[PDB]
Enzyme design. Structure first.
Site, short mmCIF file in Angstrom:
data_model
loop_
_atom_site.label_atom_id
_atom_site.label_comp_id
_atom_site.label_asym_id
_atom_site.label_seq_id
_atom_site.Cartn_x
_atom_site.Cartn_y
_atom_site.Cartn_z
N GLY A 257 10.57 6.35 26.13
CA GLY A 257 11.61 7.03 25.38
C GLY A 257 12.92 6.97 26.09
O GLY A 257 13.89 6.43 25.58
N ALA A 258 12.94 7.56 27.27
CA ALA A 258 14.10 7.54 28.13
C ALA A 258 13.65 7.84 29.58
O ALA A 258 12.47 8.06 29.84
CB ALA A 258 15.14 8.52 27.64
N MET A 259 14.60 7.80 30.51
CA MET A 259 14.32 8.02 31.90
C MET A 259 15.48 8.75 32.58
O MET A 259 16.64 8.40 32.40
CB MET A 259 14.04 6.67 32.54
CG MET A 259 13.64 6.74 34.01
SD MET A 259 12.12 7.65 34.35
CE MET A 259 12.53 8.54 35.83
N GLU A 260 15.13 9.74 33.40
CA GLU A 260 16.07 10.68 34.03
C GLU A 260 16.68 10.20 35.33
O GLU A 260 17.03 11.02 36.17
CB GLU A 260 15.38 12.01 34.42
CG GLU A 260 13.96 12.22 33.87
CD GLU A 260 12.82 12.08 34.87
OE1 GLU A 260 11.91 11.35 34.46
OE2 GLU A 260 12.81 12.70 35.99
N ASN A 261 16.81 8.90 35.54
CA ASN A 261 17.41 8.41 36.79
C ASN A 261 18.67 9.20 37.03
O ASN A 261 19.46 9.39 36.10
CB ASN A 261 17.71 6.92 36.69
CG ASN A 261 16.53 6.15 36.15
OD1 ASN A 261 15.41 6.33 36.61
ND2 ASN A 261 16.76 5.32 35.14
N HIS A 293 16.23 16.56 26.99
CA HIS A 293 15.05 16.44 27.86
C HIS A 293 15.47 15.77 29.13
O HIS A 293 15.23 16.33 30.18
CB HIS A 293 13.93 15.63 27.19
CG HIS A 293 12.67 15.53 28.00
ND1 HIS A 293 11.64 16.46 27.92
CD2 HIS A 293 12.26 14.61 28.91
CE1 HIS A 293 10.68 16.13 28.76
NE2 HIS A 293 11.03 15.02 29.38
N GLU A 294 16.12 14.60 29.06
CA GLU A 294 16.46 13.86 30.28
C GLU A 294 17.55 14.57 31.08
O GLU A 294 17.64 14.46 32.31
CB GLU A 294 16.91 12.43 29.96
CG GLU A 294 15.93 11.52 29.21
CD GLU A 294 14.50 11.61 29.70
OE1 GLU A 294 14.28 12.07 30.84
OE2 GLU A 294 13.59 11.24 28.94
N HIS A 297 15.93 17.37 33.11
CA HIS A 297 15.23 16.83 34.28
C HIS A 297 16.08 16.84 35.55
O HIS A 297 15.55 16.75 36.66
CB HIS A 297 14.76 15.39 34.01
CG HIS A 297 13.33 15.30 33.54
ND1 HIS A 297 12.28 15.75 34.30
CD2 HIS A 297 12.79 14.81 32.41
CE1 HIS A 297 11.15 15.54 33.66
NE2 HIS A 297 11.43 14.97 32.51
N1 LIG Z 1 7.27 3.80 32.30
C1 LIG Z 1 7.53 4.99 31.78
N2 LIG Z 1 8.13 5.05 30.60
N3 LIG Z 1 7.22 6.10 32.44
C2 LIG Z 1 7.46 7.45 31.93
C3 LIG Z 1 8.92 7.91 31.92
C4 LIG Z 1 9.10 9.17 31.07
C5 LIG Z 1 10.29 10.08 31.47
N4 LIG Z 1 10.11 10.62 32.84
C6 LIG Z 1 10.43 11.24 30.49
O1 LIG Z 1 9.81 12.27 30.69
O2 LIG Z 1 11.15 11.19 29.48
ZN LIG Z 2 10.40 13.95 31.03
#
Ligand SMILES: NC(=[NH2+])NCCC[C@H](N)C(=O)O
Ligand SMILES: [Zn+2]
Ligand code: NA
Ligand code: NA
Ligand code: NA
Length: 866
Positions: A257-261, A293-294, A297
C-alpha cells in the site's frame, strides 16, 4: 528454507552507529559504497554476520585495510577478527532492472525506488538488517541528470554537485538514528506538488508530493489529507512532525500500500491519486486513511521502532488503531466502526481459523512478509482498542506519553508498550497480555435470567478459544464485555448492584462467571458486546423481536446495524440449507418489515441506513458455517437481494430519487446520502428488469463522478442487466490507458456472476491494460477472481484451482510476495467439503513441487498440507 523463533531473540554482537552510503545509480548496474561505523559488544571470537541477498561483493575494508578474514556463505557475509571499534567499508553491485520481485531497489516505470521493509535493505548492501540496529544515515546519489533529475533519500539535502558526462549528485542527511527498514531512495522525473504545514509550535514543514509527469491534477486530495493528518495527530495525540520536510513519492509498481520511510514515504499510486471522475468516495476515504496511516507511523514505528519483527504489531496494531480514530474523528465514527467490524468478522476470523493462524505477536516465522496480515494489523488494532476501552481516553493518553518518554529513539517490544499503559494508568494488564500470545477467535456464550421477585437480571458469560493449527493450548482471556440493558420503552436501565453503580464494561476474565444486576425494573432486552468491545464471536439466543427492538431503539448506531446483522444471520443460514435441498428462499414478513422501517425512518442517519441495507459479503457470510458452500452462499445472497428488491420496490425507488444530488462533494453528509442512493440502486438492479436496465444505464451515462458511474456499472454486472456489455465496453474504450481506473473494471470482470467468468478472466490476461509485471493489475484480475469470487474459484470441476496454480507458477519466480497474497484462498481448503479439499490439496501438492519454490509460498503450503 529455515524457520525463526521469537524466543531466540538476542541483542546483537555488533552494532552500527553511523552509515554513509554512496550510490552510482544505473538501472542495469548500480554500485553501492557503504561506509559504516561499528562496534563489537560481543566477544572477540564472534564474527560479524552481515545479511545480503543477490549481491555482487566488490571489496571489503576494515579501517581502510583490505580485509582477508571473511567468507560469503549463503545469504551472509561473515567477517572475523575485528576490533572493538572499526570502520567497515563495503562496495557491491546490484541490478535494479532485474528486480522483478520489488524488494530492495527496483524500477517502477522509468523511475528507481526502494522497498526495504521488512528485510529488503539486504538486497541493496551487506548490513545488519534487523530493526534493533539503529544508525544515522547519510546518503549520496550520483545519476544521469536527464533520466534522474530528482534524487531523493531521507532527511535533508546537504550537498549538491554537477559532473562531467551529464551526471549530477545529491546528498541527504537524516539526523535521527534509524533501522535500515526505514531507508528510502527514489530517483526519476516527477511533477511535484509543493505546499507547507506549520506545526502547533511554529515549525514550518515543506511538503512535497512527487507524482508521474501529468498527474499534478490528481495530487491535491492526498495533500489536504496529509495536512489533516498532521493537524489531527497534533489535536488528538499531541504529536508533531519532527523534520523540516515531508516527501511522498507515488509509484505504480508496488507490492503493498505504502511505506513510512522517514521523511520519504513511498506510496502505491492507488492510495495517492484521485480526481472526481477517476476515483470513488471509497478511494478518497482510502487515500485519507493510508496517508494518515503512514504519517502516524512517524511516532508509532519510527521515533519508536520494533526490537525485532515478531514485535510488528507494536507499530501496525497501534498505527492502524490511529488511522481508525483519525477517520472516525473526521468522519462518521459508526460507519467507520461498522466497516472495521465487517472486516474483523469477515476476513480476520477466517485467517485465525486457517493454517496460517498466529497470535498478533507471532512466535514462529519463516518468511516475514507473510505476517503483514489481517491479524497483526486489524486484530492488533482491536487489541489496542480494548486497552483503550479498559483505560479510557485520558489514561490511554498518559500511557502513550509514558511510552514515548520511555522509548523515544529506540526499539521496543509489544510488552514494553503494555507496560507503559499499565504503569501510567494503574490498570493491571498482566492477564490482558495473553491477547499478544494467543491465536484464534474466542467464543463468548451468554445466558440470562430475569427474576421479577427480586428485580434482578443475571448474566452467565462463559468463554472458550478452540484449539488452532498453531496452538494446542488455549486459556481464558481478559475480555472487556460492554453491555446496555433496555427497558420496554427503549430507555436504558441504569446498571447497579447493591446500591452502587456498575461500570457497563464487564471484566470477563474466567472460563465461566456470573453477573447480577439489581433494580432491573422490567425484563430487559440487552445490547451485548457493544461497539464490538472485544474481537470475539458472541453466542446468545436472540429472538427476532429482541433484535428488531434494538434496531429501533439502541443508543449506539453500531448496535442497531449489528442487531440487523444478527437478524439476517439466522435467515442466511436457513436459506443456505434450503438452497442445498433445492428450495427457494423463505423469509418471514417481519424480517422484510424491519428493513422497510429503516428505509422510511425520516430521522435515521443515511450513512447508517446504507450500512444496514448492505448485505453481508460472501466472506462475512462464510464465517457462519463450519463447512462452506460457496455457491449456495453466493446464490442465497443474490436471492435475498432479489426478494427485498421485490418486497420493497416502491420504498427503494422513493429513497433512491430522494437522495439525488446535482453537486459532487467529498463531504461526509454527501457521501452518506450517495452511499444510500447506491445501496438502493443495487436492490432495484435485481428487481424488474426493464426498470433496472433503465435506472442503471441512466446513472452510468448521466453520472458526474466515478462513485455513481461505477455503482451502476457494478450493478449491471452483478445483475446481468441487458445494458451490461455496452457499458463495460465503453469504460474500456474511455479508460484503457489508465491502470488504476482499469483495476475497477478488472475487478468487476473477475467477480461477474456470469457462467463464462473464468473463460473471460483468461482472455483478459491478454487485455491491453493488463500485465503480469504490475501487482495492481494482478490483484484486480487474478486476485479478485480467486479471493472475491468464491463461487467461480470453487467451481466443482476444479477449474479455478488449476487457473491459480498456473498463475502462481509464474508469480513464484517473478514476485513471491504477490504470489503469497494470491495463494491464500487455496490454503483455506479445510473449510470446504471433501471433494473440493481433495482437488485443492492436489493443487497445493503441485505448487509444493515447483522447482525453485519461494520461501513465501513454502511456508503456507506446508502448513496447509499439514
Ligand atoms: N513489502 C511490504 N509491503 N512490506 C509491508 C509494508 C507495510 C507498511 N509498513 C504499512 O504498514 O503501511
Ligand atoms: Zn503500517
Ligand atoms: Na546502533
Ligand atoms: Na502532527
Ligand atoms: Na465523528
Amino acid at each position: 528454507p529455515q524457520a525463526k523463533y521469537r524466543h531466540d531473540y538476542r541483542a546483537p554482537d555488533y552494532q552500527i552507529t553511523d552509515i554513509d552510503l554512496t550510490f552510482d545509480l544505473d538501472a542495469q548496474k548500480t554500485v553501492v559504497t557503504a561506509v559504516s561505523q561499528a562496534v563489537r559488544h560481543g566477544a572477540s571470537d564472534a564474527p560479524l554476520r552481515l545479511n545480503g541477498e543477490d549481491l555482487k561483493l566488490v571489496s571489503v575494508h576494515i579501517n581502510d585495510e583490505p580485509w582477508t578474514a571473511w567468507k560469503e556463505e549463503e545469504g551472509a557475509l561473515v567477517i572475523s577478527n575485528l576490533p572493538e571499534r572499526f570502520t567497515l567499508k563495503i562496495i557491491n553491485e546490484i541490478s535494479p532492472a532485474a528486480n522483478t520481485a520489488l524488494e530492495g531497489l527496483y524500477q517502477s516505470g522509468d523511475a528507481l525506488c526502494t522497498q526495504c521493509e521488512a528485510e529488503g535493505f539486504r538486497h541493496i548492501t551487506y548490513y545488519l538488517d534487523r530493526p534493533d540496529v539503529l544508525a544515522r544515515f547519510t546518503t549520496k546519489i550520483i545519476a544521469d541528470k536527464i533520466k534522474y533529475p530528482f534524487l531523493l533519500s531521507n532527511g535533508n539535502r546537504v550537498a549538491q554537485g554537477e559532473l562531467e558526462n551529464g551526471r549530477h549528485w545529491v546528498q541527504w542527511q537524516d539526523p535521527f538514528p534509524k533501522p535500515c527498514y526505514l531507508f528510502a531512495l527514489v530517483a526519476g522525473d516527477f511533477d511535484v506538488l509543493r505546499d507547507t504545514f506549520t506545526t502547533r509550535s511554529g515549525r514550518e514543514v515543506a511538503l512535497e508530493l512527487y507524482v508521474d509527469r501529468g498527474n499534478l491534477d490528481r495530487a491535491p486530495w492526498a495533500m489536504t489529507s496529509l495536512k489533516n493528518s498532521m493537524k489531527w495527530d497534533e489535536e488528538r495525540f499531541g504529536l508533531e512532525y519532527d523534520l523540516d520536510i515531508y516527501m511522498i513519492v507515488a509509484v505504480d509498481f508496488f507490492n503493498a500500500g505504502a511505506m513510512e520511510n522517514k521523511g520519504l514515504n513511498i506510496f502505491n499510486s492507488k492510495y495517492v491519486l484521485a480526481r472526481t471522475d477517476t476515483a470513488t468516495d471509497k478511494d478518497y476515504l482510502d487515500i485519507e486513511r493510508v496517508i494518515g496511516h503512514e504519517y502516524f507511523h512517524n511516532w508509532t514505528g519510527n521515533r519508536v521502532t520494533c526490537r525485532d519483527w515478531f514485535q510488528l504489531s507494536l507499530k501496525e496494531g497501534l498505527t492502524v488503531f490511529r488511522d481508525q480514530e483519525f477517520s472516525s474523528d473526521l468522519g462518521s465514527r459508526a460507519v467507520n466502526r461498522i466497516n472495521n467490524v465487517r472486516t474483523m468478522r469477515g476476513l480476520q476470523f477466517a485467517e485465525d481459523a486457517s493454517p496460517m493462524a498466529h497470535p498478533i505477536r507471532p512466535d514462529m516465522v519463516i518468511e516475514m512478509n507473510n505476517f503483514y496480515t489481517l491479524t497483526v494489523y486489524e486484530k492488533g488494532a482491536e487489541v489496542i482498542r480494548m486497552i483503550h476501552t479498559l483505560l479510557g481516553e485520558e489514561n490511554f493518553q498518559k500511557g502513550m506519553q509514558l511510552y514515548f518518554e520511555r522509548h523515544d529513539g529506540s526499539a521496543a517490544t509489544c510488552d514494553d508498550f503494555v507496560q507503559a499503559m499499565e504503569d501510567a494508568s494503574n490498570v493491571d494488564l498482566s492477564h490482558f497480555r495473553r491477547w499478544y500470545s494467543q491465536s484464534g477467535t474466542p467464543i463468548v456464550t451468554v445466558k440470562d435470567d430475569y427474576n421479577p421477585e427480586t428485580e434482578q437480571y443475571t448474566l452467565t458469560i462463559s468463554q472458550r478459544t478452540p484449539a488452532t493449527p498453531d496452538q494446542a493450548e488455549k486459556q481464558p482471556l481478559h475480555i472487556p464485555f460492554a453491555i446496555e440493558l433496555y427497558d420496554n420503552e427503549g430507555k436504558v436501565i441504569p446498571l447497579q448492584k447493591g446500591g452502587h453503580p456498575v461500570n457497563s464494561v464487564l471484566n470477563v476474565t474466567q472460563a465461566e462467571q456470573t453477573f447480577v444486576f439489581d433494580n432491573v425494573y422490567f425484563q430487559p432486552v440487552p445490547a451485548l458486546l457493544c461497539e464490538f468491545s472485544a474481537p470475539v464471536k458472541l453466542e446468545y439466543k436472540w429472538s427476532d423481536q429482541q433484535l428488531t427492538f434494538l434496531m429501533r431503539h439502541a443508543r449506539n448506531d453500531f448496535s442497531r446495524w449489528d442487531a440487523a446483522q444478527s437478524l439476517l444471520a439466522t435467515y442466511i443460514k436457513l436459506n443456505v440449507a434450503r438452497h442445498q435441498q433445492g428450495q427457494p428462499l423463505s423469509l418471514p414478513v417481519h424480517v422484510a418489515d424491519a428493513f422497510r422501517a429503516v428505509l422510511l425512518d425520516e430521522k435515521i442517519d443515511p450513512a447508517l441506513a446504507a450500512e444496514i441495507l448492505t448485505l453481508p459479503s460472501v466472506n462475512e457470510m462464510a464465517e457462519l458455517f463450519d463447512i462452506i458452500d460457496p455457491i449456495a452462499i453466493a446464490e442465497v445472497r443474490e436471492a435475498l437481494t432479489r426478494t427485498l428488491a421485490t418486497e420493497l420496490a416502491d420504498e427503494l425507488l422513493a429513497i433512491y430519487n430522494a437522495n439525488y444530488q446535482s453537486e459532487y462533494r467529498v463531504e461526509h453528509e454527501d457521501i452518506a446520502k450517495r452511499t444510500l442512493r447506491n445501496a438502493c440502486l443495487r436492490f432495484l438492479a435485481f428487481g424488474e428488469t426493464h426498470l433496472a436496465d433503465v435506472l442503471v444505464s441512466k446513472q452510468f451515462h448521466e453520472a458526474n463522478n466515478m462513485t455513481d458511474a461505477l455503482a451502476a456499472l457494478s450493478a449491471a454486472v452483478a445483475a446481468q442487466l441487458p445494458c451490461r456489455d455496452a457499458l463495460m465496453q465503453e469504460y474500456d474504450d474511455k479508460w484503457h490507458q489508465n491502470g488504476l481506473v482499469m483495476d475497477k473494471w478488472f475487478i468487476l470482470q473477475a467477480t461477474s456472476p456470469a457462467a463464462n467468468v473464468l473463460e473471460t478472466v483468461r482472455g483478459l490476461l491478454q487485455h491491453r491494460s493488463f500485465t503480469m509485471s504490475n501487482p495492481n493489475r494482478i490483484r484486480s484480475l487474478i486476485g479478485a477472481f480467486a479471493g472475491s469470487n468464491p463461487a467461480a474459484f470453487h467451481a466443482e470441476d476444479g477449474s479455478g484451482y488449476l487457473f491459480l496454480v498456473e498463475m502462481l507458477t509464474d508469480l513464484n519466480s517473478r514476485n513471491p510476495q504477490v504470489a503469497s497474497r494470491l495463494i491464500e484462498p487455496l490454503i483455506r481448503l479445510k473449510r470446504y467439503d471433501a471433494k473440493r479439499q481433495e482437488k485443492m490439496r492436489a493443487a497445493l501438492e503441485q505448487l509444493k513441487g515447483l522447482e525453485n519454490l519461494s520461501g513465501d509460498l513454502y511456508e503456507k503450503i506446508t502448513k496447509a498440507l499439514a
